DNA sequence: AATCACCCGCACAGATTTTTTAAA
DNA sequence: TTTAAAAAATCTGTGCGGGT
DNA sequence: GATTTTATGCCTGATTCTGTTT
DNA sequence: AAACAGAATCAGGCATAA
């Protein structure tokens, strides 16, 4: 059967849904740990896989497959592009991923495909997820209700100030520059 | 400052250091690259000026014993193309300006 | 990229606008090829509220959509009596990225072809979300 | 001429110019000087601020 | 993620499908809404979002 | 530092290496089970993952990632093309 | 005209011809009849045979 | 899979690289070998592969 | 390469580099590509090979570490 | 395995349109 | 009394990073 | 997320040369 | 003195790779 609908209500409902979803869950960072949802999911998946800083490397395809098959219901090329940026010394003041292979250069060259490279966690990335197994944060559900994901990380590093952020949303945006770790620690102590 | 009088009573302004700099043995550069003159329009008199002050006049002396006096403030601002400053007749040229 | 039908009377035909290539192929495989046509969309479409007229004319997605509709555009040759189908149906995913595309298409139709909306030729589809089974 | 000792870009100026003037023009017209607009917005209790 | 047969029998079969028909009610507020939500100016859009989605939800009295 | 070499020996050794590798490990089936190495590796990976016939489905990217990252040292698009053909009713 | 019941392709015969000649020409010229070359080669004890 | 600095320092540095130089020895056997291995006919190639890869390997003393 | 081709305009004295180095992977596909390149060079430009302008690189395969 | 076109906000250099002002 | 030149005031591309 | 060019062997349909005949 | 049979050549398609 066919039921009528007014165009104003449809427009308003659809646009409000899209705007609220983008504002709250895709493009802005949390003030407590300084991460977007995709960064948090990537780090949690790497931690669950057992990919530590003093063990052997793993291929990027395996990590991308786990991330998009258990936590993140989107495409894989953008996830790989997100992972690549967290390992470049000319992008992050303190890198969070350790890479092995061709990851680009400041000259503007692109990185190799994910069938060629390998990654593992950096040493400072273990301080963002300290005491994760002692019930210090809340857990939420994934898109199926089969897995659980942390709601925020129990970080010891003021990540937002020391690494910055930049994102574009509907109606607003953000732009934060990076800082130096020792100075921020001294300010916190003061 | 440099004031250039052409063969048709046109006036242009320019700085000294804007001119080409070369050595003793060099030939020079064509001034057509610096001023929008005609094909046969050539300078005939140059009046250096330090700065503009008061309402003093400029005495212009041409060939064939012609004289003219004009207020200096009219030349305080000039465009790319000069303004006529004297109505010359036939082959009469400015030879002395102070 | 259009997959047409066999019926020649425009009052007995339908046109589907699908969100992606995979859904476009799925719709092509399982349709009634007697009186149903499929036209796939790739990527997000232009916002014709923020753009200029020549920019809208030089975009290939909008150009193909205008050609498939068959009415013409420009307020100089726009004749709403030559519409090739009398039912236009919008089919997108049931997530937040389908609402955006629905809004963009509604904006295009309302700003450029008011008579089509006035006469009631535009529809919206309702796919299900769950499936349960016990034995 | 960049190498393992670091970045190195070489620009040569004619005899009829001054290095400072061309350097200033390069500052003005290319990306040898950029602006950075600071705008600090983040999520606090689930709300932008 | 659906098989073509499921898609046909759930959405495209005229015997068992459901749809919506789009109509225009006022035609004088529709222009305002379209201009506000899809226009170039950002401030009206931000104010609209902040007024509707943020504050009105916290107090649904 | 620099060592001379004859062209005939280099050509012969390289071509024999490639030919034997392709004959014994890429394109011919085994008479006992009728599988090529890639089919066997895909099936073994799916068995290790616990992807049984009376449980829920799994994303294809996860299986392809496991196969590429643990057993098959090649590209990932041809592996997906191989997996697709094993599920078509008009091919098998 | 294929549908859910099964495959169905319709070819229309002209008024001045018999169907059999057209069908045989279609058999001879199109892919309504193909050849399959059988060649049974497999690996036995690590050798082709 | 190698970092660019490793690749340079192990393969491209003139003070550490090792390479081979190609020469021609007979020039009458090379033509026949190239024709056999890279030509159009398949039977000589199959015979050569069999002789050099089965009998000369599985049988020796 | 900048020498021309066709044995009607082919002049081996216009070579733009006097060292040509082939670098591939250490597997079987690298061997196949090496054979194809050698076939091209020997069939189409014999004088380049006869003058010793062609080389082959040799990268390592393993890296070991303890402390 | 590289290449191609849109959404979303903000800042700025460069190209077009109006408006004024000194010369014939 | 025209009438070409400044000169201001508006427009128009473009790129940053997660998504289709 | 589509389209774009090679290797490797076997079989077929369409096109182009070559000696023969009316 | 062109037709006309017979032979030789050339593309394309099929499943794993770069
Ligand atoms: C075919 O759509 C895409 C285009 N195009 C769309 C344009 C209009 C139609 C004709 N093709 C052009 C190129 C593109 F340029 C890039 C991407 C892309 O990067 C991407 C991804 O997952 O990374 C996914 N998609 C599809 C999911 C949208 C892309
Ligand atoms: Mg992309
Ligand atoms: Mg491929």
């Amino acid at each position: 059967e066919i039921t009528p609908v007014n165009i104003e209500e449809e427009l308003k409902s659809s646009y409000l849904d899209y705007a609220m979803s983008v504002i709250v869950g895709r493009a802005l960072p949390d003030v407590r740990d300084g991460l977007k949802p995709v960064h948090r999911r990537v780090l949690y998946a790497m931690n669950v896989l057992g990919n530590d800083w003093n063990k052997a490397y793993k291929k990027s395809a395996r990590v991308v497959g786990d991330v998009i098959g258990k936590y993140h219901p989107h495409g894989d090329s953008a996830v790989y592009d997100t992972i690549v940026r967290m390992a470049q010394p000319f992008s992050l003041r303190y890198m969070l991923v350790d890479g092995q292979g061709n990851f680009g250069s400041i000259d503007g060259d692109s990185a190799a495909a994910m069938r060629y490279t390998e990654i593992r966690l950096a040493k400072i990335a273990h301080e963002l997820m300290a005491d994760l197994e002692k019930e210090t944060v809340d857990f939420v559900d994934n898109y199926d209700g089969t897995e659980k994901i942390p709601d925020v990380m129990p970080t010891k590093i003021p990540n937002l100030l020391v690494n910055g952020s930049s994102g574009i949303a509907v109606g607003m945006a953000t732009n934060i520059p990076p800082h130096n770790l020792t100075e921020v620690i001294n300010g916190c102590l003061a | 400052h440099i004031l250039c009088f052409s063969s048709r009573g046109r006036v242009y302004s320019m700085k000294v250091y804007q001119l080409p700099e070369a050595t003793r043995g060099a030939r020079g550069r064509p001034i057509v690259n610096l001023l929008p003159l005609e094909q046969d329009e050539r300078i005939t008199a140059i009046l250096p000026v330090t700065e503009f002050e008061e309402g003093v006049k400029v005495f212009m002396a041409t060939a064939n014993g012609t004289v003219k006096k004009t207020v200096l403030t009219e030349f305080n601002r000039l465009r790319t193309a000069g303004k006529v400053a004297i109505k010359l007749v036939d082959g009469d040229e400015l030879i002395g300006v102070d | 990229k259009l997959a047409d039908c066999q019926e020649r009377d425009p009052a007995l035909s339908e046109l589907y606008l699908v969100e992606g290539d995979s859904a476009g192929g799925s719709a092509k495989q399982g349709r009634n090829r007697k009186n149903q046509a499929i036209l796939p969309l790739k990527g997000k479409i232009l916002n014709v509220e923020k753009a200029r007229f020549d920019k809208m004319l030089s975009s290939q997605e909008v150009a193909t959509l205008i050609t498939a509709l068959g009415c013409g555009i420009g307020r100089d040759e726009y004749n709403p009596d030559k519409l090739r189908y009398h039912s236009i149906i919008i089919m997108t995913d049931a997530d937040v990225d389908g609402s955006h595309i629905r809004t963009l298409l509604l904006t295009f139709f309302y700003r450029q072809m008011p008579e089509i909306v006035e006469r009631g030729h535009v529809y919206i589809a309702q796919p299900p979300l769950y499936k349960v089974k016990k034995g | 001429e960049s190498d393992k000792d670091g970045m190195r870009i070489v620009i040569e100026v004619k005899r009829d110019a001054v290095g400072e003037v061309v350097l200033n023009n390069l500052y003005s017209q290319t990306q040898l000087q950029v602006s950075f607009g600071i705008n600090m917005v983040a999520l606090h209790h689930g709300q932008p601020k | 993620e659906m098989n073509p047969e499921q898609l046909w029998e759930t959405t495209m079969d005229p015997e068992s499908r459901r749809m919506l028909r789009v109509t225009v009610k006022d035609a004088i507020a529709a222009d305002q809404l379209f201009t506000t939500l899809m226009g170039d100016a950002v401030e009206p859009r931000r104010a609209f979002i902040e007024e509707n989605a943020l504050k009105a939800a916290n107090i649904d009295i």
Side-chain angles (χ1 to χ4, degrees), chain A residues 61-97:
Chain A
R62 191 173 173 188
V63 181
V64 172
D66 278 330
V67 168
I68 76 169
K70 283 157 62 179
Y71 309 113
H72 203 58
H74 296 103
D76 44 332
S77 188
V79 175
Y80 183 64
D81 289 2
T82 301
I83 294 182
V84 166
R85 187 181 182 270
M86 300 163 68
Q88 292 174 342
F90 53 93
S91 300
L92 286 190
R93 186 62 171 84
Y94 302 91
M95 297 76 70
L96 298 177
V97 181

Short mmCIF file of all heavy atoms in Angstrom, two decimals, chain A residues 61-97:
data_model
loop_
_atom_site.label_atom_id
_atom_site.label_comp_id
_atom_site.label_asym_id
_atom_site.label_seq_id
_atom_site.Cartn_x
_atom_site.Cartn_y
_atom_site.Cartn_z
N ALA A 61 47.55 -6.53 5.89
CA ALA A 61 46.28 -7.06 5.42
C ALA A 61 45.53 -7.78 6.53
O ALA A 61 44.31 -7.67 6.63
CB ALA A 61 46.51 -7.99 4.23
N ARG A 62 46.25 -8.53 7.37
CA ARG A 62 45.63 -9.24 8.47
C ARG A 62 44.96 -8.28 9.45
O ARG A 62 43.82 -8.48 9.88
CB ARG A 62 46.68 -10.10 9.17
CG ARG A 62 46.16 -11.09 10.16
CD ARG A 62 47.28 -11.98 10.64
NE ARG A 62 46.87 -12.85 11.73
CZ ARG A 62 47.71 -13.62 12.42
NH1 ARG A 62 49.00 -13.64 12.16
NH2 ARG A 62 47.23 -14.37 13.40
N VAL A 63 45.67 -7.20 9.81
CA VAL A 63 45.13 -6.22 10.74
C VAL A 63 43.92 -5.51 10.15
O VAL A 63 42.91 -5.31 10.83
CB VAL A 63 46.23 -5.23 11.15
CG1 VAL A 63 45.69 -4.22 12.15
CG2 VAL A 63 47.42 -5.96 11.73
N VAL A 64 44.01 -5.12 8.88
CA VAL A 64 42.88 -4.44 8.24
C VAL A 64 41.67 -5.37 8.17
O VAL A 64 40.53 -4.94 8.41
CB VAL A 64 43.29 -3.94 6.84
CG1 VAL A 64 42.08 -3.40 6.10
CG2 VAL A 64 44.34 -2.86 6.97
N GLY A 65 41.90 -6.64 7.86
CA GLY A 65 40.80 -7.60 7.82
C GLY A 65 40.13 -7.75 9.17
O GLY A 65 38.90 -7.72 9.26
N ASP A 66 40.92 -7.87 10.24
CA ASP A 66 40.33 -7.96 11.57
C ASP A 66 39.53 -6.70 11.91
O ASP A 66 38.40 -6.79 12.41
CB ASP A 66 41.41 -8.20 12.62
CG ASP A 66 41.82 -9.65 12.71
OD1 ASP A 66 40.97 -10.52 12.45
OD2 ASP A 66 42.99 -9.92 13.05
N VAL A 67 40.10 -5.53 11.62
CA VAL A 67 39.45 -4.28 12.01
C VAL A 67 38.12 -4.12 11.30
O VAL A 67 37.10 -3.79 11.92
CB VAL A 67 40.38 -3.08 11.72
CG1 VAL A 67 39.61 -1.78 11.83
CG2 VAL A 67 41.55 -3.07 12.68
N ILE A 68 38.08 -4.36 9.98
CA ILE A 68 36.82 -4.16 9.26
C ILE A 68 35.90 -5.37 9.35
O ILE A 68 34.73 -5.26 8.93
CB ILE A 68 37.03 -3.81 7.78
CG1 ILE A 68 37.43 -5.05 6.98
CG2 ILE A 68 38.06 -2.71 7.63
CD1 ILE A 68 37.40 -4.82 5.49
N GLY A 69 36.35 -6.49 9.88
CA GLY A 69 35.48 -7.63 10.04
C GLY A 69 34.91 -7.78 11.43
O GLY A 69 34.00 -8.59 11.64
N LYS A 70 35.42 -7.02 12.40
CA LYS A 70 34.89 -7.17 13.75
C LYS A 70 34.42 -5.87 14.40
O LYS A 70 33.56 -5.91 15.28
CB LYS A 70 35.94 -7.84 14.64
CG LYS A 70 36.04 -9.34 14.42
CD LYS A 70 37.39 -9.88 14.85
CE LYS A 70 37.64 -9.66 16.32
NZ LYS A 70 38.95 -10.21 16.73
N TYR A 71 34.95 -4.72 13.98
CA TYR A 71 34.65 -3.50 14.72
C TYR A 71 34.15 -2.35 13.85
O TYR A 71 33.29 -1.58 14.28
CB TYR A 71 35.88 -3.04 15.50
CG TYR A 71 36.49 -4.12 16.36
CD1 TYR A 71 37.76 -4.63 16.08
CD2 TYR A 71 35.82 -4.64 17.46
CE1 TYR A 71 38.32 -5.61 16.86
CE2 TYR A 71 36.38 -5.62 18.24
CZ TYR A 71 37.63 -6.10 17.93
OH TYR A 71 38.19 -7.09 18.71
N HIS A 72 34.66 -2.23 12.63
CA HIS A 72 34.43 -1.04 11.81
C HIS A 72 33.72 -1.41 10.52
O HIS A 72 34.33 -2.02 9.62
CB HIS A 72 35.77 -0.36 11.50
CG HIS A 72 35.65 1.09 11.16
ND1 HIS A 72 35.07 2.01 12.00
CD2 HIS A 72 36.04 1.78 10.06
CE1 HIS A 72 35.11 3.21 11.44
NE2 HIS A 72 35.69 3.09 10.26
N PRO A 73 32.44 -1.07 10.36
CA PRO A 73 31.67 -1.49 9.17
C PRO A 73 31.76 -0.51 8.00
O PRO A 73 30.76 0.07 7.57
CB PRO A 73 30.25 -1.60 9.73
CG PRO A 73 30.20 -0.52 10.75
CD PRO A 73 31.57 -0.44 11.37
N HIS A 74 32.96 -0.32 7.47
CA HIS A 74 33.17 0.59 6.35
C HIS A 74 34.18 -0.03 5.39
O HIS A 74 34.53 -1.21 5.50
CB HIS A 74 33.60 1.97 6.86
CG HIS A 74 32.57 2.66 7.70
ND1 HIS A 74 32.65 2.72 9.07
CD2 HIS A 74 31.43 3.31 7.36
CE1 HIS A 74 31.61 3.38 9.54
NE2 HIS A 74 30.85 3.75 8.52
N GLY A 75 34.66 0.78 4.44
CA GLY A 75 35.62 0.30 3.48
C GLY A 75 37.01 0.15 4.06
O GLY A 75 37.33 0.67 5.13
N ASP A 76 37.87 -0.57 3.33
CA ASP A 76 39.19 -0.92 3.82
C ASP A 76 40.30 0.01 3.34
O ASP A 76 41.31 0.15 4.03
CB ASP A 76 39.53 -2.36 3.42
CG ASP A 76 39.17 -2.65 1.98
OD1 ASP A 76 38.23 -2.02 1.46
OD2 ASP A 76 39.83 -3.52 1.37
N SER A 77 40.14 0.63 2.17
CA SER A 77 41.17 1.53 1.66
C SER A 77 41.35 2.74 2.57
O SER A 77 42.48 3.16 2.85
CB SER A 77 40.83 1.96 0.24
OG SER A 77 41.89 2.69 -0.34
N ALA A 78 40.24 3.31 3.05
CA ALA A 78 40.33 4.44 3.97
C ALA A 78 40.94 4.03 5.30
O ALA A 78 41.67 4.82 5.92
CB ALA A 78 38.95 5.06 4.18
N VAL A 79 40.66 2.81 5.77
CA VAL A 79 41.28 2.33 7.00
C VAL A 79 42.79 2.19 6.83
O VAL A 79 43.56 2.56 7.72
CB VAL A 79 40.64 1.00 7.44
CG1 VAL A 79 41.35 0.44 8.65
CG2 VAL A 79 39.17 1.21 7.75
N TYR A 80 43.23 1.66 5.69
CA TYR A 80 44.66 1.56 5.45
C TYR A 80 45.30 2.95 5.37
O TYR A 80 46.40 3.16 5.89
CB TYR A 80 44.94 0.78 4.17
CG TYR A 80 46.41 0.60 3.90
CD1 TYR A 80 47.22 -0.13 4.77
CD2 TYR A 80 47.01 1.15 2.78
CE1 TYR A 80 48.56 -0.29 4.53
CE2 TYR A 80 48.35 0.99 2.53
CZ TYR A 80 49.12 0.27 3.41
OH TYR A 80 50.46 0.11 3.17
N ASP A 81 44.62 3.90 4.74
CA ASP A 81 45.14 5.27 4.69
C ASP A 81 45.25 5.87 6.08
O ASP A 81 46.18 6.63 6.37
CB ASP A 81 44.26 6.14 3.79
CG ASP A 81 44.40 5.79 2.33
OD1 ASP A 81 45.15 4.85 2.01
OD2 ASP A 81 43.77 6.47 1.50
N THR A 82 44.28 5.58 6.95
CA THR A 82 44.36 6.05 8.33
C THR A 82 45.54 5.42 9.07
O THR A 82 46.23 6.10 9.84
CB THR A 82 43.05 5.74 9.07
OG1 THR A 82 41.97 6.38 8.40
CG2 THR A 82 43.12 6.24 10.50
N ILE A 83 45.78 4.13 8.85
CA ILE A 83 46.89 3.46 9.52
C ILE A 83 48.23 4.02 9.04
O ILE A 83 49.18 4.13 9.81
CB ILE A 83 46.81 1.94 9.31
CG1 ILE A 83 45.57 1.37 10.01
CG2 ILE A 83 48.05 1.25 9.83
CD1 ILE A 83 45.44 -0.12 9.90
N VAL A 84 48.32 4.37 7.75
CA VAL A 84 49.59 4.85 7.20
C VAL A 84 50.00 6.17 7.85
O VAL A 84 51.19 6.40 8.12
CB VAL A 84 49.48 4.99 5.67
CG1 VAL A 84 50.64 5.79 5.12
CG2 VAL A 84 49.45 3.62 5.03
N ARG A 85 49.04 7.05 8.13
CA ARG A 85 49.37 8.37 8.65
C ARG A 85 49.91 8.32 10.07
O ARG A 85 50.67 9.20 10.48
CB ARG A 85 48.14 9.27 8.58
CG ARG A 85 48.41 10.72 8.93
CD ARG A 85 47.14 11.55 8.87
NE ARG A 85 47.40 12.95 9.15
CZ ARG A 85 47.36 13.49 10.36
NH1 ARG A 85 47.06 12.77 11.43
NH2 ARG A 85 47.63 14.78 10.51
N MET A 86 49.53 7.30 10.84
CA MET A 86 49.97 7.18 12.23
C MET A 86 51.40 6.68 12.36
O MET A 86 51.88 6.53 13.49
CB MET A 86 49.03 6.25 13.00
CG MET A 86 47.59 6.73 13.03
SD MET A 86 46.41 5.45 13.48
CE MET A 86 46.85 5.15 15.18
N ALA A 87 52.10 6.43 11.25
CA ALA A 87 53.45 5.91 11.28
C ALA A 87 54.47 6.81 10.60
O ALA A 87 55.64 6.43 10.50
CB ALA A 87 53.50 4.52 10.64
N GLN A 88 54.07 7.98 10.12
CA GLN A 88 54.97 8.87 9.40
C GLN A 88 55.60 9.88 10.34
O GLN A 88 54.87 10.58 11.06
CB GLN A 88 54.22 9.60 8.29
CG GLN A 88 53.76 8.69 7.17
CD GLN A 88 52.89 9.41 6.16
OE1 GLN A 88 52.35 10.48 6.44
NE2 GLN A 88 52.75 8.83 4.98
N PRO A 89 56.93 9.99 10.38
CA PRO A 89 57.57 10.92 11.32
C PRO A 89 57.34 12.38 11.00
O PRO A 89 57.56 13.23 11.87
CB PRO A 89 59.05 10.56 11.22
CG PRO A 89 59.09 9.21 10.59
CD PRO A 89 57.92 9.16 9.68
N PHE A 90 56.91 12.71 9.78
CA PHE A 90 56.65 14.09 9.39
C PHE A 90 55.18 14.46 9.52
O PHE A 90 54.79 15.55 9.10
CB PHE A 90 57.14 14.34 7.96
CG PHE A 90 56.62 13.36 6.95
CD1 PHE A 90 55.48 13.63 6.23
CD2 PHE A 90 57.28 12.17 6.72
CE1 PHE A 90 55.00 12.74 5.30
CE2 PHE A 90 56.81 11.27 5.79
CZ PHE A 90 55.66 11.56 5.08
N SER A 91 54.36 13.58 10.10
CA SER A 91 52.95 13.85 10.36
C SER A 91 52.64 13.92 11.85
O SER A 91 51.96 14.85 12.29
CB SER A 91 52.08 12.78 9.70
OG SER A 91 52.27 12.75 8.30
N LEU A 92 53.11 12.96 12.63
CA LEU A 92 52.87 12.91 14.06
C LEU A 92 54.13 13.27 14.83
O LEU A 92 55.23 12.84 14.48
CB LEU A 92 52.39 11.52 14.50
CG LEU A 92 50.95 11.13 14.15
CD1 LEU A 92 50.57 9.85 14.86
CD2 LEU A 92 49.99 12.24 14.51
N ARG A 93 53.96 14.08 15.87
CA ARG A 93 55.09 14.44 16.72
C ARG A 93 55.63 13.22 17.47
O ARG A 93 56.85 13.07 17.62
CB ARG A 93 54.68 15.54 17.70
CG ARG A 93 55.79 16.10 18.54
CD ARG A 93 56.86 16.77 17.71
NE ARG A 93 57.82 17.49 18.53
CZ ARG A 93 58.87 16.92 19.12
NH1 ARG A 93 59.12 15.63 19.00
NH2 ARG A 93 59.68 17.68 19.86
N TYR A 94 54.74 12.35 17.93
CA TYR A 94 55.11 11.08 18.56
C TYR A 94 54.33 9.97 17.88
O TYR A 94 53.12 9.86 18.08
CB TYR A 94 54.84 11.10 20.07
CG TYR A 94 55.56 12.21 20.81
CD1 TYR A 94 54.96 13.44 21.00
CD2 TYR A 94 56.83 12.01 21.31
CE1 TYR A 94 55.61 14.45 21.67
CE2 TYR A 94 57.49 13.02 21.98
CZ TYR A 94 56.88 14.23 22.15
OH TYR A 94 57.54 15.24 22.82
N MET A 95 55.01 9.15 17.09
CA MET A 95 54.34 8.12 16.31
C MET A 95 53.74 7.05 17.21
O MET A 95 54.27 6.74 18.28
CB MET A 95 55.31 7.48 15.32
CG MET A 95 55.86 8.44 14.27
SD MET A 95 57.13 9.53 14.92
CE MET A 95 58.47 8.38 15.19
N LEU A 96 52.63 6.47 16.76
CA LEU A 96 51.93 5.43 17.49
C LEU A 96 52.05 4.05 16.85
O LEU A 96 51.69 3.06 17.49
CB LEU A 96 50.45 5.78 17.65
CG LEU A 96 50.10 7.05 18.42
CD1 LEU A 96 48.61 7.28 18.42
CD2 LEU A 96 50.62 6.98 19.84
N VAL A 97 52.54 3.97 15.62
CA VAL A 97 52.70 2.70 14.91
C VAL A 97 54.14 2.61 14.43
O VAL A 97 54.78 3.62 14.11
CB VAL A 97 51.71 2.58 13.73
CG1 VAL A 97 51.86 1.25 13.02
CG2 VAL A 97 50.28 2.73 14.22
#
